[model samples]
Every structure is written in structure tokens, then in C-alpha cells.
Target: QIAGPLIFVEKTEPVGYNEIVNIKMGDGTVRRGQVLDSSADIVVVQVFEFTGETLKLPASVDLLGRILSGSGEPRDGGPRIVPDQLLDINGAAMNPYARLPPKDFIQTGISTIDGTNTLVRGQKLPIFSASGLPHNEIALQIARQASVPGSESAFAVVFAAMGITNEEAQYFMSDFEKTGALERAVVFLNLADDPAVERIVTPRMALTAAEYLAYEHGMHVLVILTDITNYAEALRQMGAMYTDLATLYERAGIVKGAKGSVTQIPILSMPGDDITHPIPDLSGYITEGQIVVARELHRKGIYPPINVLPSLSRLMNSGIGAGKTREDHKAVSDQMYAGYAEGRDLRGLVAIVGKEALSERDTKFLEFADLFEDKFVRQGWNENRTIEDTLEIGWQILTHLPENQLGRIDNKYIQKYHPAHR
Candidate 1:
């Protein structure tokens, strides 16, 4: 339809960017579209509705709101919407002077995430996943469980998916329904077979809703976008080179004096589990930090496969310790990291030589690592752990190591939290 959703109009007046268009097709059918580009001599329209029907010229163009499809139609089966005002889908930059630092902790109810890389309100964190991994399950788990610790009732989730199969869409919706997460969620799904043009606008539209809910309605909003690799692929297909996606992610934060904040977690799959792949690489550069999912752990029947070493939330320190999470959180994370790294090193060493060649301390660390994976890192998909439980699990694992071995943690913390001391 007009060069794959782009229509050419001759001798037409200039149109505005993202202006809604109504296409009058023959047989009394009306399709929705938007002006992609325009000039004094010609105008180019991008239709969102794909009706394969014959077109009759002289279509109408206008704008409204509610949840709209990539083609600009009501997606939620709600009544016709008249927005308070038309916003630039590209969105505006927050005033530098009015910016509020991100210092509030967002609890995701996952031990590996909450106990280690704690998400901060107004943070843009990305999840690095690979093909065939259960990233969708992970995303949904977060959508259902993520919240501000003290203000659970004031939170909402905006979920946008691009280039997903029909089955995947059904699973997402069904799971959301079964879990009752849909009530507080705003979902925008763009199918894999849908017009590639639709994928391009899906995330932007989702962010717009997030901003509205956060700023206008006084709700803390978490925006979860899945399979951004698919969105980037659509950009490559359309021959467009722009950083609009990155810009949208950067805008996720708190404005001074606003009642709430918007936190973003964008999930993308590496083509071959390669961190250096273009999609994951560029994403790493844009987001504050990444949560890397390990294929090896997945193969071992781990539910979330989060490799804590490579995964981090850059804003973690800003929101943890003292009053936010707990006084022992930072030290527990540090010791766990140091212990895991040592165990991984020994694993490679043992592979070449033998387990008998390892020292007793190294042997103890190896056992701790095994338990870390089997217990801390691998929880049931539906099991949601509180920050207290996660820290208790960490302390439980630390008991396997001698008090002298946990040099990264403060002696005070160990004396108070160590199982032997307890």
C-alpha cells in the first residue's frame, strides 16, 4: 500500500510530521495513516491500517489519543479518544535545571536483580538476552512484580513488543491476564508479520503513555520493551538511520516537582549470544547498564540465567543501603561477586588440570559458586523473593566460606549477618 505504507500525493498542500490521516478506500472502508513527510509540491503518508482494499483519493487527516496502533487506530477496543493535547511522539527534553537525580530503589522481586543490581527510579536499564532464551518470561515476571517499595499502589507498567509471533503475543496477553497484571498495564503489541512501519513507532508510542501516566496521573511507570532487536531490524529495513530509539530511552527519568517517575527496561536478543553484536552493542552504549542472561545457565535448567558478573545496574549504589534496601546489601553483593569470580576462575583452572590440584580455600569457593547457581541464581519462574529473603540467601551461601575469606565485606557486617555469628 503506497510503497509499503508510504503513499505519494501530487499537488497537495504541505502536511505536518506525525499528523493522523484517514484513508478512504473504495467499498466504504476507512483505513488509518499518518503523514510521514510533506512538502509544498508533494506529501508522503504512512498508513497504519492494512486493508488491501482499493483506495479512493482525498483522505482526511487529524489526530486523537487513547492507545493507538502503529497505523493509528484504537488498539484497546475503548471509545474514541480526544487527548488533552497532541504531543510530539519524539517527546521533549527535560529541563536540565529541573532534573531530579535518580535515587529511589525499584524492587523487581528477583534475588539476582534486587540483591545485586538494584533498579533505580528514573533509570534506563537494558536486559541482554539471546535467541531461544526465556526473555519474554523474564520480562513478564518483572512486569508483574516490579514496584516502588513504599508506594506499590501508585505504580503502573507499560509493555511494548515488536516483531513477535502470534503465539508469542497470545502467551504474553494470556500470562498477563492470568496473573492479573493487565489491569495496571498498558500493552502495545506489534506482530512480526505486521507492517514494518508499525514496529518503528511502537516504542515511541509506549513511552508517550508512560510519560502521561507518570507526570499527569501521579503514577510511577515502568516501561518494558521486548525484542528491540526486532525494532532495529525494522529500522534497517526502512533504510532509516536515526538515534530516536536511544533518545526515547534517555528521556526516561524524573522531572523536578513531578509526582512520579518513569523507569525503562528494554530487552534485546543478541543474534548469536554475542555481546559485541550491533544491537546489543549499541544498546549497551545507550543504556546506563545491562543485565546479561547466560545461555550456559539456561541450559542447566536455570529459570532466569542472570550472570551477575557481567550484569549491573549503574545506578545501584544510589538506591541501596541504610534506608532504601538494607545496611548489609552492599557488602553482601560485594562478597558474592568476589566469591563468584574466584569460583569461575577456578572452574577454568580445574578444566585444564584437576580438582585435586586446587587449594582448600579455592575448593570452598567452588562449592559456594555451585550453590550460588543452584540456589541464588536459579529460582522458580513464579517465585518472587523480597529483598530480605535475597539477602538471607546470600548470607546462607556465605556461611560456606570462612570468615577470613570474605575480605570484601566489612567485618561488622559479617559479625552481624554470618550464620555462625547469628
Candidate 2:
């Protein structure tokens, strides 16, 4: 209209920022849009849908509920949401004085996520992936399999994908439908070819839906956003002002009156696999922890290829132990971490000095490292492992190492859960 998706109406009454608008076309088709900026007389609206010759037509503003497009309409081919139930897309912030700590463990069914870098309820954890990585597949796996260990309430998945290709969108929709995850999920997609400004709204809309489902309906909601790098780029390109990244990340939490909580796993691909890029760098500062994908593991044909050493969940301790996950979860994770670190370090040492120069223990650790990647870290796309299964696999890997080498684990725990003891 005014410029691409931007519409400028002169001499109009003052309108609030981000206020929803309804643009009526000449052919009787109505499109939804949002107020980008409004002065005393000039109002600027950003259209979310296609408008060819109707840019000059009169448009009305209304705050209503519906399966919204990047602009806010029935992108999902459903009825408009109840008008009175509409909420501000720019959500409110939780007071730090009323903050609650994350405690419950979220079982993502990935050994690397659940066993090593654990995800906790009401925690903001980001997956640091790179271009060409199978992060989309991993995201789908988590959405399909993640759950609370003892939760009885309704669980919902709100997925917001920004700036992805149409093929990627189809893959997500097909996978969700095939796995029946769509039944309990709400999906908002903004394609790469779609308006760049819409990318900013897509995630906000998804979060608003999650807030409604969680606080109003008492549903434990998990919001998974893929390719947030695109969203950040939109912000950079438009040079527009919006909420701080920290505001969005901090939204994942438990409300005082609500019986439900919101958990977030935002996925962003690093440009050239560089973690210092603005997107991932700022994200790392806000999120509780990160899950890093490894190109080396992917090259070796591992499914997840998670680099566990750099991937960590800061809230892991609060959610793990006897009741939440398992009593030996902490100890087993510690030992596996120690063993893997030593093994990975030895790779460089062996490259410099050759394997023959290594000690017997070091050679065994080298073997354990290879086995860890192939056995513990690697799993099929459809494979779902319980916490018990992941632990047993870790113990099996530990069998390759002697008792004295299990320095991070307590002997009592080793006696209880070790494969040798079992």
C-alpha cells in the first residue's frame, strides 16, 4: 500500500502503537493489520495479508481474537477469535519481586537434552544450531516428545517459525500432523518470502496464545520458536523499535495464580557457526542455558550431534535428583561429562603425540569418547528414550572405564547404578 505492506493514512484520529487494525478491500475481502506508528493526525499501519488494488480502500481497526497471520487474520483457515478475548501482543512483564524459581524437569526424550543438559519447566533455553544442521528435526522431536514427568494437566506446544522456506513449513506441518502433535499444538509460520516486518509479530502472537492457554486454561505450554535469527535480522533491517530480546526470553515462567507454566526453547542458526554473532551472543546472555549442535558429529552421521561439553542447562540441578528425574542423575551426568571432556581433550593430544605415546587409561578414555558419541549421544529420529534408558546407556559406556577413573561420581552411587555393580 503506502510502501510494500506499510499503509499511511493522513489526518486520522490518534491510534495506539501495535493496536490491531482491519483493512477492508474493494472486493469485500478484509485483511488484518497492526498500527506501527501513530501521531496526532498521521497513522501508519502494516498490512499482514495481500492487497493489490485495495490499498486506497477504507480500513477499520479492531482488536479481535483469531488464528492470526503475520498481520493478524485467519491464516490457519478458522473462525475469528472471540473479540472480547483479544489481548495485547506486547505482553506484560513479571515483577522480579514475585519471581519463582524453575524446578520441574521437562523430559525432551533426547539423551543429550534430558540426560546431559536438562531442560526445566519455566526455563528459557536456546538451541545454538548452524546453517544446514538438522535443528528443525530436533525441534520437532522435542515438541512431539517433551513432557513433565508427573503432570496430569493439559500440555500444549506453541511453535512459531520465522523466515523459513515453504518446504520447511510443509515439513513441520506434515510432521506435526503425522505425529498427532498438531492436535495439541498451535503453529504460527512466517515464511522467508513473507513480509519481513511480520517476523516480529509471529513470535509475539505465539507467546500471547501460550499465555492464554497457560494462564486462562491452566495448560502447561511449551513454546518452540525456530530460526529466530531471521526475526533478529528483520529488526536490524527495518531499524524499527520493539520489545527487548530479554523481555521475550524472560516471559517463560510460572504465574502465581495459574496452575500452568510457560517453557521456551528458541532455536537460532549461527552465521558461520559463530557463537559471537549478535543474535546468539545476546541470546546467550538472556537464556538460562544453551544446547549446541556439532558439525563434526553431523558429518559422522550422528542424528543429534549435540556437543555436550558446551551445551548446559543452568537450572539442571533444581530439576534433577531422586524425585524429579533420578537420584543418580547428577552423579551420572558428572562422570559422563568428566569422561567425555578428557576424551575430547585427548583427541588433540593424540594428534600431536600419536596414540602409542598415551597411557593405558588415556587410551581407554579415547575409546570411551568414541563410544559415547556413537552409543550415548546418537539416537534415531523416531527413537524415544526414558530417563532410565539414558542412564543405563551412560552406565554401559562407563563400563569401558575402570572404577578409579570415575572421579566425578561417588563410590556409593557407582555401587548402586554402575553396570558392574548391577
Candidate 3:
């Protein structure tokens, strides 16, 4: 069966996840896709529209929603994890020759990321944070909420925290259960009492679990690695900084022949709010883009507190456009980013020269900053806004500025979606 790039196959043989399927169309043509778990007779699969071996990658772990350890064993008093096969603790990823370019949009329901930064599937995106800035809240929200917009398939969360406190880890577990995300989540937590050795192994083991689910089961997995500020240090205690960070990041990618994707979000705090430190510094160079968590807005009591000006999703152009999201998605995002940027600059200017001293246009830009923060950037702690809602809210804030100031927006989109035109 075929519908919207997903395939249902009738295979007599035993097949596994991420394994490519061959379709000899009745007309002697050919097509390709990946398999989903078998229910009865039909094997499910999704196509790249264009595009593993052992049990390393498992029978669906029955722990369903139970919290686990970096060692991949259940700590929730559930049964032990049973896998279909064993993978070397040290991994080998997708067939290098068959790796694919990542372009699918994965929405976090946070406006700053969904609208402006635009995270893409199979890409490495880091949330750069500072002390007490609530990076855990962001990652937890993402692990529960992140998903590929139109694809109808399984979505999983592999939550990895190294050297975080037990109290905080308990809070995370409470939220997962509180939010009803338990069934689809596998959380790996390493506490402060633990030595650096376990912290070092937690992240990699988390990756192994995520890769297994994503590639072997044809599910889109969001792997959230938190407190890697602890990880970087442990790796530092052992040896090199650059290559070690590099090793983990290189695993977050898509293979050409696979349909499921591993979209990694390395949530790490900058020591003393220092982005230039070795931990986040090397990270910025490795990941595709970053979603910077803003301490200013956090203090201001914004739920997400993401400042889009410093955040970016590099593959945004590839994920957003006509069919994936509304055509106005990028345009609205661009207009708002530029408008907010100008608005932010004026905040400092207004302090030096009173608002009365500024031109009318400048005054409006200053006002736009508040509007952006209040409407677009802020949302409830567990609120989820669709891509369309994000774009409309973006336009709502953009209306604070004159149509002439929206130079980044296409005239066609402005005519159709602009509040004034509407």
C-alpha cells in the first residue's frame, strides 16, 4: 500500500526496521522505502520519496515509559531491557556510503524554534544555556513534544542526563508522567553521586538506544543530552575536548537508505554563562545550528525564554516552504526576526536618549520588542502551538511595525496573511 510516501508491504520473509524494501512496480518501475514493525501480515514503511543487521538496534522494550540508566537497564523496577541483538558498546552508525542529507522539519511547539530557528530532522541542534536558565524545562518539553509534522509513525524520546541531581531527575520523571509522555519515552539519568566514569558512558549509551529505536524500528527519535557541561568535564578529566565532543555529535544523522531519523538536541549550560568555554564552544562548531536560551527573558518570567536573534536552525530553508509548512512560514519568521532585532537595539538607545528623543519609527521598533517577547516568544510551560499558529502569531507581532518596515516578507504573502490586509 502507498500513501504520502509511506509503504505497507506484504513480505513473506522476516524483515527488520531501517532495512530497505524493493518495489518492482507493476509497470516494471522501481521504488524504495524503510520498514516499520510488523503487526500481523503487513510490514509498514516510509519512503524518502527518493530513499540494519543485528538486534543491536531490539524487541520493543516493554518498559514503556519507565525511566532507565545510562547503562540501558531499567531503574524503574520494571523488567530488564531485552534486545533482539547486541551491538558493540562502541557504535558504528549508518553505512557511510548511504547517508542522506537531513531536511525534515521537527517542531518543538516553542515559537522561537518552530517559527524562527526551525529545527530539521536528522540535524544536530543545541540549546545553549546558562546557569539556572531552565534548560531542563526546554529539553523535557522538547522530548515530549518534538515530532515530524506530517509523518504518521512512531515518535520516541531518548533522554540522557549526565551528572544531574536525583531530585531534578525525579522532577523530570514526574513531568513525563504528568504530561502523559511516558509510553513513548526512554529516559536515562546519571546522578551527582555517580563518578565521572558513568557520566562519560551515559551519553553514548543514550545514543545507542536512540539509534536502535530510530533506525531499527522506523521511528523518529529526539535524543536530548543534558548537563553535558558535566560530560565535557569528565571527558576533560580523561583527555581531549574537541575530538570527544566530535565523537558524540557525529552520531546524530540520517543514513540515505533509512526513513527514521535521529534528531539530536544537546542541552548544555555554559559555565558562568560562558559560551566561549570549551564545553559549548566546541559544541557550536559541531552542531548544525543552535537554539540559544535567553537568561534575560527567563528572569522576565517567559516560559521558554528563547531569544531567536542568537538562535539558528541551519537547514531551515530545506524544511520550510510550500508543502512542508505554509508558504508564509519563512517570510513571517524573517520579518519578525529583523523587526525584533531592530527593536532590541533600540532598548539600549532609549536608555541613553529618552524615547521622546527618538523618531516615531524608532519608538515603534522599541515597542515591537515587548510585543515580540510577550506574544511570540512566550508560551505556557506545556503549551503546544502548531506551525500555522506560530506563523500567525508572528504576523500578529509584526503588525506592530508598518508594512514598509517588513522588507524581508514577500509582497504576495504580505497581501494574503498580513492582519491589515486580512
Q: What is the TM-score of each candidate against the true structure?
A: 0.80, 0.81, 0.81
TM-score of 3: 0.81
Candidate 3: segments with Cα more than 4 A from true spot: 1-63, 93-97, 236-240, 273-281, 284-286
Checking candidate 3 for backbone clashes, the offending pairs are 36-44, 55-85, 98-256, 100-256
Position 120, candidate 2: lDDT: 85
Model 3 lDDT, residue 260, Cα: 80
Model 1 lDDT tens row, 1-422:
32344443332444577676664442355667676654444444655532122211111111212334543345656765455544434342222213667777888899888898888888887888888888878888998888788864388888888888978777886777688888788777888887676676677667766776677567788989898888767763332233345455666887455568888888867676433335533543345787888889999888798999799888889889898889999999998998998888888888877988888988999898999998899888777788988999999888889867678899888788777677
What are the lDDT figures for the candidates, one per model?
A: 0.71, 0.72, 0.72
Error of 3 at 111 (Å): 0.5
How many angstroms is residue 163 displaced in model 3 relative to the true structure, after the best TM-score fit? 1.2
lDDT of 3 by residue, 158-188 (tens): 8888988878878887888878887788888
Q: Residue 355's C-alpha lDDT in candidate 2?
A: 81
**Candidate 1: stretches off by over 4 Å:** 1-68, 76-86, 92-97, 236-242, 273-281, 284-287
Evaluated against the true structure, the overall lDDT of model 2 is 0.72
